[PDB]
């Protein structure tokens, strides 16, 4: 098992005409494998949809992925933006 593989490759043809959005060298980086898309970094380790207690076939279409991400209320953020200045 080696560590020093390249995994980043550049085609010699300069196609930098419509390429202002991708990841450039500063040429285009062409990796060996695809990317990883992660939804949220912080998990909600409580929240009994995930905790599964052992008391008492049901579905629940929860609104989006933002239930499991620990977001603060706008009341405190306004209380903190008043604490800003």
């Amino acid at each position: 098992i080696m560590i020093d593989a390249a995994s980043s490759f550049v085609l010699p043809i300069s196609i930098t005409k419509n390429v202002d959005v991708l990841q450039r060298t500063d040429e285009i980086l062409w990796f060996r494998g695809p990317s990883v898309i992660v939804n949220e970094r912080i998990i909600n380790s409580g929240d009994p949809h995930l905790s599964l207690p052992l008391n008492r076939n049901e579905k629940e279409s929860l609104p989006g992925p933002f239930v499991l991400g620990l977001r603060p209320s706008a009341k405190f953020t306004a209380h903190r933006l008043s604490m800003l200045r």
Binding site: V38, N39, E40, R41, I42, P53, L54, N55, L70, P72, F76, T77, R80, L81, L84
Partner: protein, 235 residues
């Protein structure tokens, strides 16, 4: 034989009905040495709820259900004992006491320190006690070496930054660095000991060339003179 943990092993393996600990006088009474009245809040009490709910279907092969249901009466009694005792507590409060803050400051601080087992100041050789020091050091390393590697933080100050769905806020590793400075300094302790051995035994092994009152003492200045006496030549 860990009767309160074999039920947790049967619950975690999702097969507490296929064996159900085989409750007889030879098995249900051997691991107990009446169930031993478990200690946790609900980690060993919700087990007995599912253990009874699973053993409701055999209901006769397991004679220990009477021992479990007797402690169900004792739990409902001592909660009812406390709920009358909490009510007789809340009426027995004097309407004026005016609890002092700086003692409650000394009561909030000393309780928080005594929770997680650290030494509390009052403000109110010998290898026997050398093992009792290193048994607390190795206690700490084995407690730091059971924390998960993906530990992250959340301060109350990130709401001024407006973190998006994928923004990578810079306060995520303010607990992870402090847990590895602690874990690695508890292994380089005999490394700074060797440097401090080489530091003390290099500044103190002379002790009479830099220290002024010792090199200006009568006995040292005579002895440093006496060792430099060259030999007398005969004839």
């Amino acid at each position: 034989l860990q009767e309160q943990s074999e039920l947790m092993s049967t619950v975690m393996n999702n097969t507490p009905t296929t064996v159900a600990a085989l409750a007889a006088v030879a098995a249900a009474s051997e691991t107990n040495g009446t169930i031993p009245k478990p200690r946790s809040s609900a980690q060993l009490e919700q087990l007995l709820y599912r253990y009874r709910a699973i053993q409701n279907h055999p209901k006769e092969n397991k004679l220990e259900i009477k021992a479990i249901e007797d402690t169900f009466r004792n739990i409902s009694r001592d909660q009812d004992i406390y709920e009358t005792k909490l009510d007789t507590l809340r009426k027995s409060i004097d309407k004026g006491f005016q609890y002092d803050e700086d003692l409650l400051n000394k009561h909030l601080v000393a309780l928080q320190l005594l929770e997680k087992d650290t030494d509390v100041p009052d403000y109110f050789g010998d290898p026997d006690t050398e093992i009792r020091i290193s048994a607390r050091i190795s206690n700490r390393i084995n407690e730091l070496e059971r924390l998960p590697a993906n530990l992250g933080t959340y301060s109350l100050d990130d709401c001024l930054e407006f973190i998006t769905k994928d923004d990578l806020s810079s306060r995520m590793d303010t607990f992870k660095i402090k847990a590895l400075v602690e874990l690695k300094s508890l292994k380089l302790l005999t490394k700074q000991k060797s440097i401090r051995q080489k530091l003390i035994n290099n500044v103190a092994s002379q002790a009479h060339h830099n220290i002024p009152y010792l090199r200006d003492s009568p006995f040292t200045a005579a002895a440093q003179r006496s060792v430099q006496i060259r030999s007398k030549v005969i004839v």
